[PDB]
Design a protein around this nucleic acid. Sequence first.
RNA 1: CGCUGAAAGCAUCUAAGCGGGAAGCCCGCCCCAAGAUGAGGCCUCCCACGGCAGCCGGUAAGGACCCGGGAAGACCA
RNA 2: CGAUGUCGGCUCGUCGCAUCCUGGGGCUGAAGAAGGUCCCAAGGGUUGGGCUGUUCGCCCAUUAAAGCGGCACGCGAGCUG
Lengths: 204, 37, 140, 174
Amino acid sequence: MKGILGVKVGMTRIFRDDRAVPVTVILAGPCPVVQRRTPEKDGYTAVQLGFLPQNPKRVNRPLKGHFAKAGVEPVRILREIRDFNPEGDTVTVEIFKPGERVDVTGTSKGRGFAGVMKRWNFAGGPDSHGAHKIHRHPGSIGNRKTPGRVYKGKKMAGHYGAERVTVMNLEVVDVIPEENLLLVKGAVPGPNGGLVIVRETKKA
Amino acid sequence: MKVRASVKRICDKCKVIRRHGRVYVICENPKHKQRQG
Amino acid sequence: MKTYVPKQVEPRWVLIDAEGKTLGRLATKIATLLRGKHRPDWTPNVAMGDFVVVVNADKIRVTGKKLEQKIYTRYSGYPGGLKKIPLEKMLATHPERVLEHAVKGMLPKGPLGRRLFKRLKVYAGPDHPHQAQRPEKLEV
Amino acid sequence: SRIGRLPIPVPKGVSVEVAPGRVKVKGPKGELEVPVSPEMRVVVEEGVVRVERPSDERRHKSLHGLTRTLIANAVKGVSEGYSKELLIKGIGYRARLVGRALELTVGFSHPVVVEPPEGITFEVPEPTRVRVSGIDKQKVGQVAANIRAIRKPSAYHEKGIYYAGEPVRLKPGK
RNA sequence: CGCUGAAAGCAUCUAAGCGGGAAGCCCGCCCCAAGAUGAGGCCUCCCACGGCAGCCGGUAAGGACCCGGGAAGACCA
RNA sequence: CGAUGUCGGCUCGUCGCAUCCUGGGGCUGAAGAAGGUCCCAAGGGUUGGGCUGUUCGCCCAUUAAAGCGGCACGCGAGCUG
Ligand SMILES: [Mg+2]
Ligand SMILES: [Mg+2]
Ligand SMILES: [Mg+2]
Ligand SMILES: [Mg+2]
Ligand SMILES: [Mg+2]
Ligand SMILES: [Mg+2]
Ligand SMILES: [Mg+2]
Ligand SMILES: [Mg+2]
Ligand SMILES: [Mg+2]
Ligand SMILES: [Mg+2]
Ligand SMILES: [Mg+2]
Ligand SMILES: [Mg+2]
Ligand SMILES: [Mg+2]
Ligand SMILES: [Mg+2]
Ligand SMILES: [Mg+2]
Ligand SMILES: [Mg+2]
Ligand SMILES: [Mg+2]
Ligand SMILES: [Mg+2]
Ligand SMILES: [Mg+2]
Ligand SMILES: [Mg+2]
Ligand SMILES: [Mg+2]
Ligand SMILES: [Mg+2]
Ligand SMILES: [Mg+2]
Ligand SMILES: [Mg+2]
Ligand SMILES: [Mg+2]
Ligand SMILES: [Mg+2]
Ligand SMILES: [Mg+2]
Ligand SMILES: [Mg+2]
Ligand SMILES: [Mg+2]
Ligand SMILES: [Mg+2]
Ligand SMILES: [Mg+2]
Ligand SMILES: [Mg+2]
Ligand SMILES: [Mg+2]
Ligand SMILES: [Mg+2]
Ligand SMILES: [Mg+2]
Ligand SMILES: [Mg+2]
Ligand SMILES: [Mg+2]
Ligand SMILES: [Mg+2]
Ligand SMILES: [Mg+2]
Ligand SMILES: [Mg+2]
Ligand SMILES: [Mg+2]
Ligand SMILES: [Mg+2]
Ligand SMILES: [Mg+2]
Ligand SMILES: [Mg+2]
Ligand SMILES: [Mg+2]
Ligand SMILES: [Mg+2]
Ligand SMILES: [Mg+2]
Ligand SMILES: [Mg+2]
Ligand SMILES: [Mg+2]
Ligand SMILES: [Mg+2]
Ligand SMILES: [Mg+2]
Ligand SMILES: [Mg+2]
Ligand SMILES: [Mg+2]
Ligand SMILES: [Mg+2]
Ligand SMILES: [Mg+2]
Ligand SMILES: [Mg+2]
Ligand SMILES: [Mg+2]
Ligand SMILES: [Mg+2]
Ligand SMILES: [Mg+2]
Ligand SMILES: [Mg+2]
Ligand SMILES: [Mg+2]
Ligand SMILES: [Mg+2]
Ligand SMILES: [Mg+2]
Ligand SMILES: [Mg+2]
Ligand SMILES: [Mg+2]
Ligand SMILES: [Mg+2]
Ligand SMILES: [Mg+2]
Ligand SMILES: [Mg+2]
Ligand SMILES: [Mg+2]
Ligand SMILES: [Mg+2]
Ligand SMILES: [Mg+2]
Ligand SMILES: [Mg+2]
Ligand SMILES: [Mg+2]
Ligand SMILES: [Mg+2]
Ligand SMILES: [Mg+2]
Ligand SMILES: [Mg+2]
Ligand SMILES: [Mg+2]
Ligand SMILES: [Mg+2]
Ligand SMILES: [Mg+2]
Ligand SMILES: [Mg+2]
Ligand SMILES: [Mg+2]
Ligand SMILES: [Mg+2]
Ligand SMILES: [Zn+2]
């Protein structure tokens, strides 16, 4: 397992073998190793990566000590990649090559309080033929005296988005190491400027 | 396999066996294979 | 004269080897110890029984076809959320829970009963981390 | 009218050592451990092993004949050894030896390769005759059955993989 | 559906034992999750402050308020 | 009976399995292909339209299939009427 922390920068498309290829562009590296998780000390294997240099003023003393222990300049974000133990002490975009398949995790765009139609694709109600103030309403939410209650997990309106989402098996279309750039075919969760995690895919 | 409540010898080559809690009839004639159920 | 009521007593730590013992017949004894009903000064509204440590809980034994046919059951509260787990799989995955479940069902319901269950410490394998309490070995 | 009491002739030189819950049979061709019920007593005599039961209840009567045959099969297995022959029938159907592996060409879109488990050796004398041989009687019949299952005898044609000596029973087509 | 195999000299997938075998079952994938009060783990930071398992006060690492805001958002977070 | 709102539709599901399809099987009067019959199996899936208030049903065009039942003949402090 290998992975890297990144920033979603934007979308475009390239031309490859006379095909337009939609791509999301990710500024991925470089990621200094900041802590390693070992079975003896932590009970599992992973690597805590850092990402983006931080104004040291904004780094309090417990964080400062953490960066010192593993002699590393102060960084804005710490995230672990599970079951990854890179040989070096810096993870860059070159762990992936064009043609590989990756999974990308982001924080999806936040819909706030979402209706039953936007969040769950409910059909809503008719817009004429007598329909009375229920055009976007959920309809029935149960039965009658049996069971006399509503199921856990019943689909209802509420906050929707700004949540962790992983899209799987994305083709790496290009790697530009001079710019720590990764080109991933298709759509990646969240807004431009959003933190993302790019890992080798779990689909065989 | 015939599955029924009455399992019986059909011909004289039929054998009534008990197998894993169930009465089967096995035979050289495949039509006669029976499981009680 | 009023019936004797005990002042707070230091509880007795005991150690029991579960290897080879019959699951439910061992559990009735452990619950007795947890309630402290072996004690001449038993009082039902205080926690005054023993602390019980158990080792080799994964080597507990069982009669008939229970390894395959005894089903533990968990209900999540969601539609279709009844999970059925057989004894076999539970012993292969969380063996200490087999004895833990048996004993819990034999303790009283309520706040004291739940407190008594916390005084039970069950370990798969021959070892336990309570050496500092110096548990007294019991043959039961 | 009793297998459990039939004494087991042990040829020289195969040795039979008895132990709790099992008996071990060494011979010119290997070792076999027979796991044996503790309720049964296995008795070593001059060139003869015998099995004795402790009562006449049904379970003891049933374990008695089993245990004698199990030990006898091991005795045969280390001295004589076991084998089972398979005959391939059908036009395109052939077999060949690929290293130690068995390759069957039996009408699929592809050859079927069977690896030998330890203690099993595959022989292909001619292309339509396969030999499964080993010291473990149960294992030999298992591997032979697996190879037959790859293309069982057809119900309408002399086509497939047969046990040597298996009668060819065809029902009519059209 | 078998292998080996008695009881029951034969036979038997079974009584001892072993194998194969479903979109189904467990796991594997994705998301939540230590109020998991059984409240877990690791890294790092602070420190033995005055007065009279308690109390009063001033600090420590830090935190909150306030303000500029935000593809975060009903408010709050 | 000092009130437990009714058919049908819409919306939203959820469950049973006597299974419509898909997966695994045995028997066949199973050559193959296609079927028939029984067994295991409830994970998912199970179309759009004409008629009629209809449920149902008939029909058109498809389909792997166009399953059958329970939930106050599920669901009117959710809508229709
Ligand atoms: Mg993120
Ligand atoms: Mg919003
Ligand atoms: Mg809505
Ligand atoms: Mg929508
Ligand atoms: Mg949606
Ligand atoms: Mg609609
Ligand atoms: Mg609409
Ligand atoms: Mg309408
Ligand atoms: Mg109106
Ligand atoms: Mg309106
Ligand atoms: Mg509604
Ligand atoms: Mg109603
Ligand atoms: Mg209820
Ligand atoms: Mg939110
Ligand atoms: Mg390119
Ligand atoms: Mg964006
Ligand atoms: Mg007759
Ligand atoms: Mg027969
Ligand atoms: Mg006692
Ligand atoms: Mg028992
Ligand atoms: Mg555990
Ligand atoms: Mg109880
Ligand atoms: Mg009570
Ligand atoms: Mg001898
Ligand atoms: Mg004697
Ligand atoms: Mg046989
Ligand atoms: Mg007979
Ligand atoms: Mg058995
Ligand atoms: Mg098996
Ligand atoms: Mg099996
Ligand atoms: Mg087989
Ligand atoms: Mg298997
Ligand atoms: Mg599939
Ligand atoms: Mg998490
Ligand atoms: Mg916690
Ligand atoms: Mg957590
Ligand atoms: Mg609990
Ligand atoms: Mg904690
Ligand atoms: Mg831990
Ligand atoms: Mg400050
Ligand atoms: Mg009334
Ligand atoms: Mg009233
Ligand atoms: Mg009233
Ligand atoms: Mg009223
Ligand atoms: Mg009516
Ligand atoms: Mg329904
Ligand atoms: Mg059924
Ligand atoms: Mg089917
Ligand atoms: Mg089928
Ligand atoms: Mg056919
Ligand atoms: Mg025909
Ligand atoms: Mg035909
Ligand atoms: Mg059929
Ligand atoms: Mg049948
Ligand atoms: Mg059947
Ligand atoms: Mg189903
Ligand atoms: Mg279901
Ligand atoms: Mg269904
Ligand atoms: Mg019309
Ligand atoms: Mg018209
Ligand atoms: Mg219509
Ligand atoms: Mg109609
Ligand atoms: Mg009309
Ligand atoms: Mg009608
Ligand atoms: Mg008509
Ligand atoms: Mg068609
Ligand atoms: Mg069909
Ligand atoms: Mg229709
Ligand atoms: Mg109904
Ligand atoms: Mg009715
Ligand atoms: Mg009616
Ligand atoms: Mg109704
Ligand atoms: Mg209805
Ligand atoms: Mg209604
Ligand atoms: Mg109304
Ligand atoms: Mg209505
Ligand atoms: Mg209502
Ligand atoms: Mg109402
Ligand atoms: Mg209502
Ligand atoms: Mg009501
Ligand atoms: Mg209407
Ligand atoms: Mg009207
Ligand atoms: Zn017959």
